[PDB]
Amino acid sequence: GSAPKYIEHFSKFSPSPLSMKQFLDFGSSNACEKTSFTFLRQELPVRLANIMKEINLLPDRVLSTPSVQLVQSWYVQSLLDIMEFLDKDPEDHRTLSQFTDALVTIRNRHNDVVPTMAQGVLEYKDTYGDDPVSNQNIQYFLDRFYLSRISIRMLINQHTLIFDGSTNPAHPKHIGSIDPNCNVSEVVKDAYDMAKLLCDKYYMASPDLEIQEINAANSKQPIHMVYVPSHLYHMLFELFKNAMRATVESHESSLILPPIKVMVALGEEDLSIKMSDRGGGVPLRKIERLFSYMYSTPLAGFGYGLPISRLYAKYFQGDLQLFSMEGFGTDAVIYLKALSTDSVERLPVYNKSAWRHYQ
Amino acid sequence: GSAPKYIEHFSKFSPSPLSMKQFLDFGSSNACEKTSFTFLRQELPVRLANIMKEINLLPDRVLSTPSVQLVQSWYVQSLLDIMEFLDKDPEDHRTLSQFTDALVTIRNRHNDVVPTMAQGVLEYKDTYGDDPVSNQNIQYFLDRFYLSRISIRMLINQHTLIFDGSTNPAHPKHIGSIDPNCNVSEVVKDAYDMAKLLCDKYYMASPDLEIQEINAANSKQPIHMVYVPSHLYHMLFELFKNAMRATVESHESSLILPPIKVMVALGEEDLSIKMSDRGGGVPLRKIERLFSYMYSTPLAGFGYGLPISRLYAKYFQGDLQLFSMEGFGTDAVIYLKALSTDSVERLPVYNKSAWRHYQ
Ligand SMILES: Nc1ncnc2c1ncn2[C@@H]1O[C@H](COP(=O)(O)OP(=O)(O)O)[C@@H](O)[C@H]1O
Ligand SMILES: Nc1ncnc2c1ncn2[C@@H]1O[C@H](COP(=O)(O)OP(=O)(O)O)[C@@H](O)[C@H]1O
Ligand SMILES: [Mg+2]
Ligand SMILES: [Mg+2]
The missing domain is CATH 3.30.565.10 (Histidine kinase-like ATPase, C-terminal domain)
Structure with missing residues (x-):
């Protein structure tokens, strides 16, 4: 019963943009899931909260749709999902392997967002019409919503792919x-x-x-x-x-x-x-x-x-x-x-x- | 001592867009400077007033520049210039030949507007700087100012060119x-x-x-x-x-x-x-x-x-x-x-x- 509290809190921070170089050094040398783990524990909640904060300020006529409401529930659950690790200690080779499993589970939970959101667009079209204004608003919202999603999936894929389990390959293309x-x-x-x-x-x-x-x-x-x-x-x-x-x-x-x-x-x-x-x-x-x-x-x-x-x-x-x-x-x-x-x-x-x- | 009055009045009307066809029939068949004369007497003052109304609402720091002030005086004089014919009668083959001469004089009076306005842009750049906001405002204003000017010159050129004096050619390419x-x-x-x-x-x-x-x-x-x-x-x-x-x-x-x-x-x-x-x-x-x-x-x-x-x-x-x-x-x-x-x-x-x- 505290998701609204979490959202409002992390909603205070701004997401932190990473350069292609940082990404490269994140998996390269610094690379120790501990470094990534400690980063993602705070970053993901900041990115999730920011997009969720935006959704909640949508007209209630859009807000209340089964589409938006359903998707909005996945993000709430994903937030609480990652929270579990805010107080843990990363020296436990098991504390971070559960983070990895936690990410893979969050990624697949959002796998059908586009189709789902698309359904809400169709409802609106038949429920209220397709006027330049409602179009501009939807366009504005979706572009941001989706970009945010792309950035979050990037962080998660970089972590899961890079820390598959042991460094056999050691030195990759x-x-x-x-x-x-x-x-x-x-x-x-x-x-x-x-x-x-x-x-x-x-x-x-x-x-x-x-x-x-x-x-x-x-x-x-x-x-x-x-x-x-x-x-x-x-x-x-x-x-x-x-x-x-x-x-x-x-x-x-x-x-x-x-x-x-x-x-x-x-x-x-x-x-x-x-x-x-x-x-x-x-x-x-x-x-x-x-x-x-x-x-x-x-x-x-x-x-x-x-x-x-x-x-x-x-x-x-x-x-x-x-x-x-x-x-x-x-x-x-x-x-x-x-x-x-x-x-x-x-x-x-x-x-x-x-x-x-x-x- | 009544230009501000004229401006505020004709500033009530909206300009009337003409199609390429209307333009063609304006010089073709309907073509009788009387028809054009009666049209331009009200149209030009509406177009001049509308752009002048916009200028006057510019920040005083732009307003007061010698550039803007000088150009602003030409438009005020052009307005009063065309006004002279608001009460005249067009059956006088001399009342409309003075309108033609009045147009040619107004056209050449504004012949150096671009360079002049450009000078005001340069002053602003050195006087206040070149920030995205001041740029967006200037861009917004100039695009409208200049488009308006293009439309007015189009009306005037169509009239002056078409009513050169007698229909010798009669039927042209x-x-x-x-x-x-x-x-x-x-x-x-x-x-x-x-x-x-x-x-x-x-x-x-x-x-x-x-x-x-x-x-x-x-x-x-x-x-x-x-x-x-x-x-x-x-x-x-x-x-x-x-x-x-x-x-x-x-x-x-x-x-x-x-x-x-x-x-x-x-x-x-x-x-x-x-x-x-x-x-x-x-x-x-x-x-x-x-x-x-x-x-x-x-x-x-x-x-x-x-x-x-x-x-x-x-x-x-x-x-x-x-x-x-x-x-x-x-x-x-x-x-x-x-x-x-x-x-x-x-x-x-x-x-x-x-x-x-x-x-
Ligand atoms: N190269 C192109 N030539 C002509 N029409 C195009 C071209 N690219 C896209 N379109 C048009 O733009 C629309 C496609 O946008 P898109 O978002 O790719 O969806 P989809 O292809 O599934 O319909 C097409 O439906 C087509 O009408
Ligand atoms: N085809 C082109 N290839 C490369 N640069 C171009 C091209 N067209 C325009 N530019 C650039 O855009 C600017 C021109 O805008 P313009 O308003 O025509 O002014 P001007 O040519 O007098 O400088 C040029 O100064 C040049 O730097
Ligand atoms: Mg396609
Ligand atoms: Mg050029």
Whole structure:
């Protein structure tokens, strides 16, 4: 009977953004679950509390929905779940192995949040309508809610993956979900192949791929970076699925089926990935709506592919944009930060500032 | 001693947006300066008053500057200038020929507004600094101020050009500044040639041009539209100058000098023009600043080429965007509305809504 108390307390702190370097040293040298354990015991409760504090200030008409209420209960339970370790002592090789098991259990407990929240969006649409204002509010809330979730899952995956149990491997290519030497083109190739498979099965035809690299400072060196490869895969995959669908459907009474071209450019601070297709394009007017949760609610189904992929890009100070040419095709660009130094977590925070965005 | 009275009165009305069709019929059939005269006598004072009402609510620290004060005096005089005809009778072939002369005199009186206002921006920068907030406010104000000016000059040019004196020509290709059959590629070609000339004189080297059309519905028909060609020329010219400078300066220790490629695509509602260069690109972080009046204050000099070109595009419901690839190049896209029906003036209005954007 004290969750409201915990929430209000940790709701006083601000989340602490970690850089890609800190993440690397967290699993590298300093790496002793004790250091991580002591960090996550306070950090997770601060991040959970902050997003929960935001939820509770939602209109009661949204608040009371079975969707929001159910999800809101998982976060309350997860908070209390991690609390158990606030007073424990980390020298006990069993106190921290229970923390690891506690994390894995919290992660899977939230595994269906997107679909669940999506259901609440649909109810609202039929219960109150889809007006620019309610859309802006939902968009504002979901973008922050989901970004927060991405950051929390990152902390948990880094801990669970890194402390699997003993250091046999000792010295790895990867540090949890992070690859200090990620070959961008390879990930492009992978996401493409997976999309192609789906495309062939459903349309029994699929455009090919062309890749071009532009290493500004070192003309012919392959482009590598420090990043979370699974995150990059997700964005590329969602983009490849859209490009394929459009290209195929727009050339049905045509035999020709142009390829999808990808360019990977590396500058002094940006690492840019552009995916160009000829799937007919979209009118500038409808582009804005493609990133909407409300308005966007085989290969395609719901409308979370674009908006959530953007959040992944933004997570480490990057971005994802779309510019099309109705009657021809579309360019989708993923902007990432080239230097591990500029790669720092972007986290939404609860303040008097975040309060008036709902007024 | 009654300008404040006039301002407050006409400040009660909202400007009336005209469609490209109305503009065409205004000079076409209905066309009788009497019809235009009676329209402009009330419309101009409503548009002048609305922008003047906005100026007067500017912080006194901006208000009091010689710049703003001087410009503010021209608009006050122009208002009183047109007022003279509020009680006159239009059957007098001399009452309306004095209106025409009155317009030409008002147009030239405001011919140096941009430079003058720019001077006020520079003073503010050194007098109070360049912080995100003061920048946002200035940007907000200037975008509206200038759009308003573009709309007023459009009305005046349509009247003066159309009623030059007698209908010798009787039946023209053009209706004032509007071309009901504008060949986009031709205007592209013209702006390119003018930019090339300047580029050659200053750098004694210039990239070439390639043009590609994509007529979705009619594969090989040349792309025509109803538009104000001088406006399109201006945007293309400013874009060509940037693309040329960048391309040349970024390949100085290179002999190769890649071309500037332009694509003109015509869809069901959009007519898009993309200009692609290989001038090295810009970091995503600095792109935002390129459209700033404050932050942007040979070929290039001041920083009004981009922001003002965007206003021209927005004027008839279009847009102008920039997306770059640091280490490679940049894409600049002009979005226009394909159908004359969707081509309607976009005008800023003074309301309680426009008031709180300065708070
Ligand atoms: N490259 C593209 N060309 C044309 N339309 C596109 C493209 N990418 C996305 N879209 C449009 O945007 C919408 C997709 O957003 P998304 O969030 O990925 O969901 P989904 O693909 O499951 O419908 C599509 O439904 C499609 O109408
Ligand atoms: N295609 C481009 N490639 C690289 N930089 C560009 C490009 N277009 C514009 N810029 C940058 O944006 C700025 C220009 O904005 P603009 O308002 O046109 O003013 P100006 O060209 O007179 O400086 C330039 O000063 C340049 O630094
Ligand atoms: Mg998709
Ligand atoms: Mg310029």
